[PDB]
């Protein structure tokens, strides 16, 4: 169902897109995984520890 | 006040002066090692990966 939903959107089925590099402008070999992860900011902030 | 001239003073007191970095559960002697500082815009100690 993840693959079938990735086929409803026009995305590649493997979940992996070829990505270029912003520094050199040239392709990363062996396509990498891009997606959306729900990332959280925990309350261990660095200018309360320094 | 941290005026514009004390940062050159700071780069002239750092230069060849090592510091002892120490991770909090030190078990053997390789858990206290001395480095030379390189100043960081930031608030986090940048630590060389192999170490």
């Amino acid at each position: 169902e993840i693959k079938e939903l990735l086929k409803l959107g026009d995305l590649p089925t493997s979940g992996q897109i070829r990505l270029y590099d912003g520094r050199t402008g040239e392709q990363f070999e062996r396509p990498v995984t891009v997606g959306y992860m729900y990332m959280l900011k925990l309350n261990h902030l660095v200018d309360d520890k320094m | 006040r941290e005026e514009a001239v004390v940062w050159d003073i700071l780069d002239e007191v750092i230069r060849e002066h090592p510091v002892l970095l120490n991770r909090a559960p030190t078990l053997h002697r390789l858990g206290i090692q001395a480095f030379e500082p390189v100043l960081i815009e930031g608030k986090a100690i940048q630590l060389h990966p192999l170490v």
Binding site: V32, Y38, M39, L40 | -
Partner: protein, 227 residues
Amino acid sequence: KPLVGTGMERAVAVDSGVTAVAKRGGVVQYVDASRIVIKVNEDEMYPGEAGIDIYNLTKYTRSNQNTCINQMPCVSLGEPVERGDVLADGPSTDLGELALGQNMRVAFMPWNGYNFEDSILVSERVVQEDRFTTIHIQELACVSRDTKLGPEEITADIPNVGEAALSKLDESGIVYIGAEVTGGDILVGKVTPKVKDSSLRVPNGVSGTVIDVQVFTRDGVEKDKRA
């Protein structure tokens, strides 16, 4: 709004009382960021006590972990709501769901060593959009204790300061509301007759905006003018 959730976000965001769940259904008569005034449909409405429900929202205030608990209305003006429906989204909620963090485009790859053991390498588009810029609130007390040789005033006049202290302090010595302060500033001027400066000063390293000033006074001690 977590794109990949489990559907239990709704029950946690309602059942923990951080959102303003509607008590009686009906039509919105008024929406402000302060209050929400709900006209009640007649079937859920009592015969006497004609009655329209006025939800007071809790704006920017201190949590127990110095985070900011804040409620924002998620219904417009003149819009039907049902019993049990949500009206104001609390902290970390989005239309009645449960939004702790935020959803971002993530690549899995080594990138030049900057994500070596467990580190994480972040674009500037995350920090330009303020999409993690959280809001912390600090309560700071200043107390006028009763000591020997005389009590301690909350006056504005402080020995061994200049104009750079009193430029932030009012006719009564307490900081204005809305004054942007940094570390080493003066908030409440308090003096000790020996006279030594015992004023409230902003802690080292913090900035901020004075959002609220509360003054508590014992019955019998007279009031400075800001009180």
